[PDB]
Amino acid sequence: AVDIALLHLRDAHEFAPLLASYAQALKRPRRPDDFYAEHLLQDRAAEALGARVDGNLVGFVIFYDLPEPVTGLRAGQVDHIYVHHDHRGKGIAKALIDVLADKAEERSWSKLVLNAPRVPEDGRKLYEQIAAAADWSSYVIRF
Amino acid sequence: AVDIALLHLRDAHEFAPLLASYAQALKRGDDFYAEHLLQDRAAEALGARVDGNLVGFVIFYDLPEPVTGLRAGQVDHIYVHHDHRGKGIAKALIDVLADKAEERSWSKLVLNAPRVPEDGRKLYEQIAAAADWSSYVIRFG
């Protein structure tokens, strides 16, 4: 039932409302919904995996394939995961991370870093069950 | 007289031993890896020169911010040669990076400090606010 595949620029319009719902948690929009979907899908540094149920796009995960200077290999980095609220309790978010983790060999990843925002809690609630706590510390300067 | 400028491929030869010394402490267990790093589409490296010699660097990513449609900078690695500590060079590198924020319309600069070596943390905790997100890792191998 759950079909997971990489999103491309073709999918911006379908991706747009799903991304808009996720952003409504993280607050802020002088652009329409399609602008944010098209903007991300035209950045070659970002990739997004999508989850479809019965033809409808009902989840996504945005990830970066980044250089890893310490080992000289690469690493994946996830900052954003979201499942449509009518499709909770189905294990979809974990299915998205599982597919991403399975790309490790293809991409020469030594690791997958998962960053969970404070709100919404869904990324955090998933990651703490399926991954190890990070041992580095993080800081931010706002502009 | 610290001279701070973005590193390019020509700088790879000087950058490599500085990256190797930093990487030594970070973890362990390629002669041209610095060229791969300096030609990545997401990563960039700022270098610090004193009397012509490259003595420090910071590696950063200019990443999309899907929520806002902007960009944001992310620092995971900073290093200053051990004979050039106590001169404010690490802070100066972050200061130049903050200047690029307006040029690049960054809403924020994320600073990630590994557990070892502690120099990044000791700098970041004095110049920035603690992060309010949480992080996790799945390792392969």
PDB file of C-alpha atoms in Angstrom:
ATOM      1  CA  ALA A   1       0.000   0.000   0.000  1.00  0.00           C
ATOM      2  CA  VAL A   2       2.698   2.576   0.928  1.00  0.00           C
ATOM      3  CA  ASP A   3       4.648   3.636  -2.195  1.00  0.00           C
ATOM      4  CA  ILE A   4       7.876   5.521  -1.467  1.00  0.00           C
ATOM      5  CA  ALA A   5       9.849   7.256  -4.229  1.00  0.00           C
ATOM      6  CA  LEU A   6      12.056  10.313  -4.697  1.00  0.00           C
ATOM      7  CA  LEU A   7      10.227  13.553  -5.500  1.00  0.00           C
ATOM      8  CA  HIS A   8      11.195  15.611  -8.553  1.00  0.00           C
ATOM      9  CA  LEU A   9      10.287  19.044  -9.924  1.00  0.00           C
ATOM     10  CA  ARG A  10       7.254  17.483 -11.649  1.00  0.00           C
ATOM     11  CA  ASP A  11       5.791  16.887  -8.182  1.00  0.00           C
ATOM     12  CA  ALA A  12       6.007  20.455  -6.845  1.00  0.00           C
ATOM     13  CA  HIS A  13       2.261  21.083  -7.068  1.00  0.00           C
ATOM     14  CA  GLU A  14       1.412  17.824  -5.291  1.00  0.00           C
ATOM     15  CA  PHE A  15       4.163  18.473  -2.728  1.00  0.00           C
ATOM     16  CA  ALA A  16       3.066  22.082  -2.139  1.00  0.00           C
ATOM     17  CA  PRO A  17       0.116  21.556   0.290  1.00  0.00           C
ATOM     18  CA  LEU A  18       1.920  18.827   2.219  1.00  0.00           C
ATOM     19  CA  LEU A  19       4.845  21.187   2.733  1.00  0.00           C
ATOM     20  CA  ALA A  20       2.426  23.987   3.593  1.00  0.00           C
ATOM     21  CA  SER A  21       0.855  21.920   6.386  1.00  0.00           C
ATOM     22  CA  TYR A  22       4.286  21.109   7.848  1.00  0.00           C
ATOM     23  CA  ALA A  23       5.357  24.755   7.764  1.00  0.00           C
ATOM     24  CA  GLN A  24       2.164  25.738   9.616  1.00  0.00           C
ATOM     25  CA  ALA A  25       3.662  24.044  12.686  1.00  0.00           C
ATOM     26  CA  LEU A  26       7.004  25.881  12.371  1.00  0.00           C
ATOM     27  CA  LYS A  27       5.197  29.227  11.758  1.00  0.00           C
ATOM     28  CA  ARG A  28       6.543  32.120   9.668  1.00  0.00           C
ATOM     29  CA  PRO A  29       3.981  33.784   3.827  1.00  0.00           C
ATOM     30  CA  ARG A  30       4.388  36.294   0.975  1.00  0.00           C
ATOM     31  CA  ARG A  31       4.786  33.382  -1.500  1.00  0.00           C
ATOM     32  CA  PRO A  32       2.070  30.919  -2.556  1.00  0.00           C
ATOM     33  CA  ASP A  33       2.412  27.271  -1.581  1.00  0.00           C
ATOM     34  CA  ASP A  34       3.812  26.279  -4.948  1.00  0.00           C
ATOM     35  CA  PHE A  35       6.766  28.635  -4.615  1.00  0.00           C
ATOM     36  CA  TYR A  36       8.212  26.827  -1.603  1.00  0.00           C
ATOM     37  CA  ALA A  37       7.766  23.436  -3.252  1.00  0.00           C
ATOM     38  CA  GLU A  38       9.342  24.565  -6.538  1.00  0.00           C
ATOM     39  CA  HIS A  39      12.166  26.406  -4.749  1.00  0.00           C
ATOM     40  CA  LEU A  40      13.255  23.326  -2.792  1.00  0.00           C
ATOM     41  CA  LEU A  41      12.821  20.939  -5.689  1.00  0.00           C
ATOM     42  CA  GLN A  42      15.163  23.097  -7.825  1.00  0.00           C
ATOM     43  CA  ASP A  43      18.007  23.023  -5.260  1.00  0.00           C
ATOM     44  CA  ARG A  44      20.323  20.184  -6.334  1.00  0.00           C
ATOM     45  CA  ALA A  45      21.786  19.987  -2.804  1.00  0.00           C
ATOM     46  CA  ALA A  46      18.391  18.948  -1.356  1.00  0.00           C
ATOM     47  CA  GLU A  47      16.409  15.809  -2.062  1.00  0.00           C
ATOM     48  CA  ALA A  48      13.005  14.740  -0.854  1.00  0.00           C
ATOM     49  CA  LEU A  49      11.504  11.275  -0.550  1.00  0.00           C
ATOM     50  CA  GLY A  50       7.726  11.016  -0.889  1.00  0.00           C
ATOM     51  CA  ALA A  51       5.187   8.505   0.412  1.00  0.00           C
ATOM     52  CA  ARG A  52       2.002   7.797  -1.542  1.00  0.00           C
ATOM     53  CA  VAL A  53      -1.116   5.937  -0.359  1.00  0.00           C
ATOM     54  CA  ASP A  54      -3.807   5.003  -2.953  1.00  0.00           C
ATOM     55  CA  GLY A  55      -2.253   7.455  -5.399  1.00  0.00           C
ATOM     56  CA  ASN A  56      -2.248  10.383  -2.930  1.00  0.00           C
ATOM     57  CA  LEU A  57       0.965  11.929  -1.550  1.00  0.00           C
ATOM     58  CA  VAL A  58       0.640  11.684   2.252  1.00  0.00           C
ATOM     59  CA  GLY A  59       4.212  12.047   3.627  1.00  0.00           C
ATOM     60  CA  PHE A  60       7.707  13.348   2.894  1.00  0.00           C
ATOM     61  CA  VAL A  61      11.254  13.540   4.203  1.00  0.00           C
ATOM     62  CA  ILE A  62      13.774  16.195   3.089  1.00  0.00           C
ATOM     63  CA  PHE A  63      17.437  15.171   3.219  1.00  0.00           C
ATOM     64  CA  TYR A  64      20.890  16.357   2.214  1.00  0.00           C
ATOM     65  CA  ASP A  65      23.672  14.193   0.795  1.00  0.00           C
ATOM     66  CA  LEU A  66      26.608  16.029   2.375  1.00  0.00           C
ATOM     67  CA  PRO A  67      30.380  15.551   2.480  1.00  0.00           C
ATOM     68  CA  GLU A  68      31.697  14.092   5.748  1.00  0.00           C
ATOM     69  CA  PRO A  69      35.171  15.613   6.211  1.00  0.00           C
ATOM     70  CA  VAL A  70      36.303  13.453   9.127  1.00  0.00           C
ATOM     71  CA  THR A  71      35.992  10.069   7.381  1.00  0.00           C
ATOM     72  CA  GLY A  72      36.298  11.407   3.854  1.00  0.00           C
ATOM     73  CA  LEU A  73      32.994   9.744   2.902  1.00  0.00           C
ATOM     74  CA  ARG A  74      29.539  11.319   2.843  1.00  0.00           C
ATOM     75  CA  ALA A  75      26.634  11.494   5.279  1.00  0.00           C
ATOM     76  CA  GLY A  76      22.881  12.070   5.011  1.00  0.00           C
ATOM     77  CA  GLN A  77      21.135  14.794   6.996  1.00  0.00           C
ATOM     78  CA  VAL A  78      17.385  15.013   7.701  1.00  0.00           C
ATOM     79  CA  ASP A  79      15.928  18.219   9.117  1.00  0.00           C
ATOM     80  CA  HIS A  80      12.292  17.761   8.116  1.00  0.00           C
ATOM     81  CA  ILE A  81       9.831  14.884   8.153  1.00  0.00           C
ATOM     82  CA  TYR A  82       6.055  15.083   7.908  1.00  0.00           C
ATOM     83  CA  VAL A  83       3.088  12.717   7.569  1.00  0.00           C
ATOM     84  CA  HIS A  84      -0.401  13.966   6.708  1.00  0.00           C
ATOM     85  CA  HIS A  85      -2.536  13.931   9.845  1.00  0.00           C
ATOM     86  CA  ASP A  86      -5.096  11.494   8.354  1.00  0.00           C
ATOM     87  CA  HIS A  87      -2.349   8.919   7.836  1.00  0.00           C
ATOM     88  CA  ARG A  88      -0.826   8.756  11.319  1.00  0.00           C
ATOM     89  CA  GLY A  89      -0.548   5.509  13.226  1.00  0.00           C
ATOM     90  CA  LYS A  90       0.485   3.654  10.061  1.00  0.00           C
ATOM     91  CA  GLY A  91       4.276   3.602  10.435  1.00  0.00           C
ATOM     92  CA  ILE A  92       4.786   5.827   7.368  1.00  0.00           C
ATOM     93  CA  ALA A  93       7.443   8.137   8.869  1.00  0.00           C
ATOM     94  CA  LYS A  94       9.557   5.149   9.912  1.00  0.00           C
ATOM     95  CA  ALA A  95       9.084   3.689   6.427  1.00  0.00           C
ATOM     96  CA  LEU A  96      10.511   6.924   4.963  1.00  0.00           C
ATOM     97  CA  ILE A  97      13.590   6.825   7.214  1.00  0.00           C
ATOM     98  CA  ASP A  98      14.064   3.108   6.434  1.00  0.00           C
ATOM     99  CA  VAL A  99      14.159   3.781   2.677  1.00  0.00           C
ATOM    100  CA  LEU A 100      16.590   6.631   3.263  1.00  0.00           C
ATOM    101  CA  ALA A 101      18.828   4.456   5.447  1.00  0.00           C
ATOM    102  CA  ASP A 102      18.894   1.783   2.684  1.00  0.00           C
ATOM    103  CA  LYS A 103      20.545   4.311   0.350  1.00  0.00           C
ATOM    104  CA  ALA A 104      23.614   4.323   2.642  1.00  0.00           C
ATOM    105  CA  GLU A 105      25.668   1.947   0.488  1.00  0.00           C
ATOM    106  CA  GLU A 106      24.633   3.635  -2.762  1.00  0.00           C
ATOM    107  CA  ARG A 107      25.693   7.028  -1.393  1.00  0.00           C
ATOM    108  CA  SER A 108      28.794   5.970   0.665  1.00  0.00           C
ATOM    109  CA  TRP A 109      27.171   7.252   3.831  1.00  0.00           C
ATOM    110  CA  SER A 110      28.989   6.585   7.084  1.00  0.00           C
ATOM    111  CA  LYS A 111      25.934   7.903   8.941  1.00  0.00           C
ATOM    112  CA  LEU A 112      22.492   9.464   8.756  1.00  0.00           C
ATOM    113  CA  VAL A 113      22.048  12.520  10.985  1.00  0.00           C
ATOM    114  CA  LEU A 114      18.465  13.187  12.089  1.00  0.00           C
ATOM    115  CA  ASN A 115      17.586  16.636  13.438  1.00  0.00           C
ATOM    116  CA  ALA A 116      14.206  17.025  15.133  1.00  0.00           C
ATOM    117  CA  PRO A 117      12.658  20.476  15.597  1.00  0.00           C
ATOM    118  CA  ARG A 118      11.149  21.265  18.975  1.00  0.00           C
ATOM    119  CA  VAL A 119       7.783  21.706  17.259  1.00  0.00           C
ATOM    120  CA  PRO A 120       6.247  19.635  15.761  1.00  0.00           C
ATOM    121  CA  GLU A 121       7.265  16.789  18.104  1.00  0.00           C
ATOM    122  CA  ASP A 122       6.652  13.991  15.558  1.00  0.00           C
ATOM    123  CA  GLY A 123      10.235  13.881  14.266  1.00  0.00           C
ATOM    124  CA  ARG A 124      11.539  13.709  17.840  1.00  0.00           C
ATOM    125  CA  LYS A 125       9.073  11.022  18.900  1.00  0.00           C
ATOM    126  CA  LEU A 126      10.157   8.859  15.968  1.00  0.00           C
ATOM    127  CA  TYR A 127      13.923   9.445  16.149  1.00  0.00           C
ATOM    128  CA  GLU A 128      14.361   8.724  19.820  1.00  0.00           C
ATOM    129  CA  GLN A 129      12.941   5.240  19.229  1.00  0.00           C
ATOM    130  CA  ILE A 130      14.919   4.397  16.084  1.00  0.00           C
ATOM    131  CA  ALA A 131      18.275   6.185  16.443  1.00  0.00           C
ATOM    132  CA  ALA A 132      21.043   6.992  18.896  1.00  0.00           C
ATOM    133  CA  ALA A 133      21.175  10.306  20.715  1.00  0.00           C
ATOM    134  CA  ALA A 134      23.658  12.682  19.125  1.00  0.00           C
ATOM    135  CA  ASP A 135      26.811  13.353  21.114  1.00  0.00           C
ATOM    136  CA  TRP A 136      27.670  16.751  19.687  1.00  0.00           C
ATOM    137  CA  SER A 137      26.124  20.017  20.809  1.00  0.00           C
ATOM    138  CA  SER A 138      24.485  22.736  18.724  1.00  0.00           C
ATOM    139  CA  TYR A 139      24.021  26.509  18.780  1.00  0.00           C
ATOM    140  CA  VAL A 140      22.414  29.179  16.625  1.00  0.00           C
ATOM    141  CA  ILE A 141      22.881  32.822  15.687  1.00  0.00           C
ATOM    142  CA  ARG A 142      19.730  34.513  14.400  1.00  0.00           C
ATOM    143  CA  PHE A 143      19.704  37.340  11.845  1.00  0.00           C
TER     144      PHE A 143
ATOM    145  CA  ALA B   1      46.985  40.829  10.828  1.00  0.00           C
ATOM    146  CA  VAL B   2      44.653  37.882  10.173  1.00  0.00           C
ATOM    147  CA  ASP B   3      43.673  37.544   6.494  1.00  0.00           C
ATOM    148  CA  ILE B   4      40.384  35.682   6.076  1.00  0.00           C
ATOM    149  CA  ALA B   5      39.148  34.624   2.629  1.00  0.00           C
ATOM    150  CA  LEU B   6      37.173  31.757   1.110  1.00  0.00           C
ATOM    151  CA  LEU B   7      39.251  28.762   0.131  1.00  0.00           C
ATOM    152  CA  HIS B   8      39.241  27.560  -3.499  1.00  0.00           C
ATOM    153  CA  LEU B   9      40.813  24.637  -5.339  1.00  0.00           C
ATOM    154  CA  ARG B  10      44.179  26.413  -5.594  1.00  0.00           C
ATOM    155  CA  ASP B  11      44.238  26.382  -1.783  1.00  0.00           C
ATOM    156  CA  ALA B  12      43.789  22.612  -1.549  1.00  0.00           C
ATOM    157  CA  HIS B  13      47.474  21.828  -1.042  1.00  0.00           C
ATOM    158  CA  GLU B  14      47.794  24.150   1.970  1.00  0.00           C
ATOM    159  CA  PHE B  15      44.367  23.204   3.287  1.00  0.00           C
ATOM    160  CA  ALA B  16      45.033  19.444   3.290  1.00  0.00           C
ATOM    161  CA  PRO B  17      47.503  19.262   6.251  1.00  0.00           C
ATOM    162  CA  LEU B  18      45.302  21.594   8.297  1.00  0.00           C
ATOM    163  CA  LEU B  19      42.277  19.365   7.584  1.00  0.00           C
ATOM    164  CA  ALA B  20      44.330  16.258   8.336  1.00  0.00           C
ATOM    165  CA  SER B  21      45.455  17.587  11.723  1.00  0.00           C
ATOM    166  CA  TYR B  22      41.877  18.503  12.614  1.00  0.00           C
ATOM    167  CA  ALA B  23      40.500  15.193  11.334  1.00  0.00           C
ATOM    168  CA  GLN B  24      43.133  13.323  13.378  1.00  0.00           C
ATOM    169  CA  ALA B  25      41.601  14.502  16.664  1.00  0.00           C
ATOM    170  CA  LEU B  26      37.985  14.207  15.495  1.00  0.00           C
ATOM    171  CA  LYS B  27      37.911  10.485  14.631  1.00  0.00           C
ATOM    172  CA  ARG B  28      39.847   7.622  13.063  1.00  0.00           C
ATOM    173  CA  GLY B  29      39.576   3.886  12.495  1.00  0.00           C
ATOM    174  CA  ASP B  30      42.971   9.887   0.360  1.00  0.00           C
ATOM    175  CA  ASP B  31      45.674  12.331  -0.709  1.00  0.00           C
ATOM    176  CA  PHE B  32      43.233  14.547  -2.631  1.00  0.00           C
ATOM    177  CA  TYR B  33      40.273  14.604  -0.274  1.00  0.00           C
ATOM    178  CA  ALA B  34      40.573  18.370   0.273  1.00  0.00           C
ATOM    179  CA  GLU B  35      39.994  18.860  -3.458  1.00  0.00           C
ATOM    180  CA  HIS B  36      36.760  16.848  -3.224  1.00  0.00           C
ATOM    181  CA  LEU B  37      35.634  18.916  -0.253  1.00  0.00           C
ATOM    182  CA  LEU B  38      36.427  22.279  -1.818  1.00  0.00           C
ATOM    183  CA  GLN B  39      34.511  21.356  -5.000  1.00  0.00           C
ATOM    184  CA  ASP B  40      31.290  20.193  -3.281  1.00  0.00           C
ATOM    185  CA  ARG B  41      28.144  22.104  -4.173  1.00  0.00           C
ATOM    186  CA  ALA B  42      27.009  22.503  -0.553  1.00  0.00           C
ATOM    187  CA  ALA B  43      30.234  22.854   1.437  1.00  0.00           C
ATOM    188  CA  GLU B  44      32.525  25.875   1.542  1.00  0.00           C
ATOM    189  CA  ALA B  45      35.576  26.625   3.646  1.00  0.00           C
ATOM    190  CA  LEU B  46      36.823  29.919   5.027  1.00  0.00           C
ATOM    191  CA  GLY B  47      40.571  30.156   5.637  1.00  0.00           C
ATOM    192  CA  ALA B  48      42.633  32.277   8.008  1.00  0.00           C
ATOM    193  CA  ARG B  49      46.127  33.340   6.968  1.00  0.00           C
ATOM    194  CA  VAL B  50      48.785  34.846   9.233  1.00  0.00           C
ATOM    195  CA  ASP B  51      51.993  36.159   7.622  1.00  0.00           C
ATOM    196  CA  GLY B  52      51.048  34.286   4.460  1.00  0.00           C
ATOM    197  CA  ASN B  53      50.621  30.944   6.244  1.00  0.00           C
ATOM    198  CA  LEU B  54      47.228  29.239   6.403  1.00  0.00           C
ATOM    199  CA  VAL B  55      46.595  28.666  10.128  1.00  0.00           C
ATOM    200  CA  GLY B  56      42.838  28.105  10.469  1.00  0.00           C
ATOM    201  CA  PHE B  57      39.615  27.198   8.752  1.00  0.00           C
ATOM    202  CA  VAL B  58      35.889  26.761   9.186  1.00  0.00           C
ATOM    203  CA  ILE B  59      33.866  24.350   7.005  1.00  0.00           C
ATOM    204  CA  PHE B  60      30.261  25.396   6.416  1.00  0.00           C
ATOM    205  CA  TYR B  61      27.185  24.471   4.399  1.00  0.00           C
ATOM    206  CA  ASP B  62      24.845  26.942   2.771  1.00  0.00           C
ATOM    207  CA  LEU B  63      21.634  24.877   2.928  1.00  0.00           C
ATOM    208  CA  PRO B  64      18.058  25.562   1.816  1.00  0.00           C
ATOM    209  CA  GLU B  65      15.485  26.364   4.455  1.00  0.00           C
ATOM    210  CA  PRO B  66      12.373  24.602   3.096  1.00  0.00           C
ATOM    211  CA  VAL B  67       9.959  26.324   5.499  1.00  0.00           C
ATOM    212  CA  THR B  68      10.932  29.929   4.630  1.00  0.00           C
ATOM    213  CA  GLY B  69      12.344  29.520   1.141  1.00  0.00           C
ATOM    214  CA  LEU B  70      15.570  31.099   2.341  1.00  0.00           C
ATOM    215  CA  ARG B  71      19.007  29.712   3.025  1.00  0.00           C
ATOM    216  CA  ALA B  72      20.799  29.163   6.284  1.00  0.00           C
ATOM    217  CA  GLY B  73      24.396  28.457   7.123  1.00  0.00           C
ATOM    218  CA  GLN B  74      25.544  25.432   9.054  1.00  0.00           C
ATOM    219  CA  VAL B  75      28.991  25.043  10.628  1.00  0.00           C
ATOM    220  CA  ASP B  76      30.167  21.576  11.596  1.00  0.00           C
ATOM    221  CA  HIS B  77      33.962  21.984  11.664  1.00  0.00           C
ATOM    222  CA  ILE B  78      36.321  24.718  12.866  1.00  0.00           C
ATOM    223  CA  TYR B  79      40.065  24.436  13.487  1.00  0.00           C
ATOM    224  CA  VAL B  80      42.967  26.740  14.363  1.00  0.00           C
ATOM    225  CA  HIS B  81      46.599  25.621  14.272  1.00  0.00           C
ATOM    226  CA  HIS B  82      47.791  24.964  17.832  1.00  0.00           C
ATOM    227  CA  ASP B  83      50.613  27.495  17.553  1.00  0.00           C
ATOM    228  CA  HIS B  84      48.051  30.224  16.743  1.00  0.00           C
ATOM    229  CA  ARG B  85      45.565  29.780  19.588  1.00  0.00           C
ATOM    230  CA  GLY B  86      44.794  32.611  21.967  1.00  0.00           C
ATOM    231  CA  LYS B  87      44.555  35.178  19.168  1.00  0.00           C
ATOM    232  CA  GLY B  88      40.791  35.238  18.505  1.00  0.00           C
ATOM    233  CA  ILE B  89      41.151  33.636  15.067  1.00  0.00           C
ATOM    234  CA  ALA B  90      38.224  31.192  15.477  1.00  0.00           C
ATOM    235  CA  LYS B  91      35.924  34.054  16.488  1.00  0.00           C
ATOM    236  CA  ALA B  92      37.182  36.094  13.523  1.00  0.00           C
ATOM    237  CA  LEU B  93      36.288  33.228  11.147  1.00  0.00           C
ATOM    238  CA  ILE B  94      32.732  33.067  12.541  1.00  0.00           C
ATOM    239  CA  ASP B  95      32.495  36.876  12.315  1.00  0.00           C
ATOM    240  CA  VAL B  96      33.274  36.824   8.580  1.00  0.00           C
ATOM    241  CA  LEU B  97      30.697  34.051   8.163  1.00  0.00           C
ATOM    242  CA  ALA B  98      28.100  36.200   9.947  1.00  0.00           C
ATOM    243  CA  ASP B  99      28.900  38.961   7.449  1.00  0.00           C
ATOM    244  CA  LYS B 100      28.082  36.692   4.532  1.00  0.00           C
ATOM    245  CA  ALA B 101      24.624  36.137   6.105  1.00  0.00           C
ATOM    246  CA  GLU B 102      23.265  39.445   4.807  1.00  0.00           C
ATOM    247  CA  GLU B 103      24.819  38.812   1.363  1.00  0.00           C
ATOM    248  CA  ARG B 104      23.253  35.350   1.206  1.00  0.00           C
ATOM    249  CA  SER B 105      20.005  36.231   3.044  1.00  0.00           C
ATOM    250  CA  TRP B 106      20.617  33.671   5.767  1.00  0.00           C
ATOM    251  CA  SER B 107      17.947  33.699   8.461  1.00  0.00           C
ATOM    252  CA  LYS B 108      20.287  31.929  10.856  1.00  0.00           C
ATOM    253  CA  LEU B 109      23.673  30.327  11.300  1.00  0.00           C
ATOM    254  CA  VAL B 110      23.642  26.852  12.886  1.00  0.00           C
ATOM    255  CA  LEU B 111      26.848  25.917  14.721  1.00  0.00           C
ATOM    256  CA  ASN B 112      27.452  22.236  15.459  1.00  0.00           C
ATOM    257  CA  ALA B 113      30.293  21.380  17.854  1.00  0.00           C
ATOM    258  CA  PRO B 114      31.660  17.813  18.041  1.00  0.00           C
ATOM    259  CA  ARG B 115      32.397  16.400  21.483  1.00  0.00           C
ATOM    260  CA  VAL B 116      36.137  16.368  20.666  1.00  0.00           C
ATOM    261  CA  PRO B 117      37.982  18.530  20.005  1.00  0.00           C
ATOM    262  CA  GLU B 118      36.210  20.932  22.372  1.00  0.00           C
ATOM    263  CA  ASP B 119      37.396  24.209  20.783  1.00  0.00           C
ATOM    264  CA  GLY B 120      34.229  24.657  18.723  1.00  0.00           C
ATOM    265  CA  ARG B 121      31.978  24.193  21.768  1.00  0.00           C
ATOM    266  CA  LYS B 122      34.093  26.511  23.920  1.00  0.00           C
ATOM    267  CA  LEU B 123      33.729  29.196  21.249  1.00  0.00           C
ATOM    268  CA  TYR B 124      30.085  28.614  20.322  1.00  0.00           C
ATOM    269  CA  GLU B 125      28.734  28.540  23.851  1.00  0.00           C
ATOM    270  CA  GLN B 126      30.152  32.052  24.420  1.00  0.00           C
ATOM    271  CA  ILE B 127      29.016  33.601  21.090  1.00  0.00           C
ATOM    272  CA  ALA B 128      25.659  31.920  20.392  1.00  0.00           C
ATOM    273  CA  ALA B 129      22.422  30.697  21.890  1.00  0.00           C
ATOM    274  CA  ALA B 130      21.992  27.032  22.716  1.00  0.00           C
ATOM    275  CA  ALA B 131      19.968  25.092  20.157  1.00  0.00           C
ATOM    276  CA  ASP B 132      16.431  24.053  21.067  1.00  0.00           C
ATOM    277  CA  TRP B 133      16.186  21.120  18.642  1.00  0.00           C
ATOM    278  CA  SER B 134      17.487  17.611  19.301  1.00  0.00           C
ATOM    279  CA  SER B 135      19.621  15.361  17.158  1.00  0.00           C
ATOM    280  CA  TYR B 136      20.114  11.703  16.467  1.00  0.00           C
ATOM    281  CA  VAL B 137      22.353   9.499  14.406  1.00  0.00           C
ATOM    282  CA  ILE B 138      22.162   6.146  12.650  1.00  0.00           C
ATOM    283  CA  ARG B 139      25.635   4.780  11.891  1.00  0.00           C
ATOM    284  CA  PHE B 140      26.591   2.472   9.026  1.00  0.00           C
ATOM    285  CA  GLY B 141      29.459   0.000   9.142  1.00  0.00           C
TER     286      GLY B 141
END
